């Protein structure tokens, strides 16, 4: 799975997820499913930024800590959005609120809801995608057009269908744990 991430991912992404999980003091080398998890949804987090127009979007997520919680401090400051607990995905300037990406290898609903345990009361809107084709928004409200959606979930399907020819699906599928 080290070799397939390496190969699928680009250098970028690699190197974020691999900085996360040893900042958990975790090694990519031995928790790879976790590695692949991560970069999947940094892809995803990308490709959902690059969806809308120019400017639509600002990239929460992949940035250290202090540059994170100072675009957030920064966006609220200047909107009025109030200030969410943890730090969210992304922020969305047209619809003017913070965004919650998940990639599921289990199911949308259950993912769905644990995100929503997490945020609670928060204002944030939730996005979920799994690897066959589902997704699960807050308010049914997509965000993105169609085509954008189809381009991510496409994109899904293509990794599990890569790390299927692999043999390595199975072991990444069982692998998500509940909350
Ligand atoms: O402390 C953390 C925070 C996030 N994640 C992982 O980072 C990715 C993105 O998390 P989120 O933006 O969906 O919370 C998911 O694979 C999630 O498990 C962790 O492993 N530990
Ligand atoms: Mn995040
Ligand atoms: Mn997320």
Redesign the pocket.
């Given at each position: 799975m080290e070799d397939f991430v390496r190969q699928c991912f680009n250098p970028m992404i690699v190197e974020l997820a691999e900085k996360?999980?040893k900042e958990?003091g975790?090694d990519p080398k031995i928790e790879t499913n976790?590695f692949a998890?991560?970069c999947?949804?940094?892809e995803v987090?990308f490709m959902y930024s690059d969806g809308g127009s120019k400017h639509r979007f600002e990239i929460i997520?992949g940035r250290d800590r202090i540059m994170a919680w100072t675009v957030v401090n920064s966006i609220c400051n200047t909107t009025g959005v109030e200030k969410p607990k943890?730090?969210?995905?992304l922020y969305d300037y047209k619809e003017n609120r913070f965004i919650?990406?998940?990639?599921t290898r289990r199911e949308v609903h259950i993912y769905y809801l644990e995100?929503a345990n997490?945020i609670k009361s928060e204002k944030t809107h939730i996005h979920i995608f799994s690897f066959t084709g589902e997704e699960m928004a807050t308010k049914a409200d997509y965000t993105l057009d169609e085509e954008s959606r189809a381009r991510i979930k496409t994109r899904l399907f293509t990794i599990r269908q890569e790390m299927a020819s692999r043999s390595l699906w199975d072991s990444f599928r069982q692998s998500e744990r509940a909350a």
């Open positions: 996360a999980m958990y975790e976790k998890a991560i999947t949804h940094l987090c997520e943890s730090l969210p995905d919650e990406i998940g990639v995100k997490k």
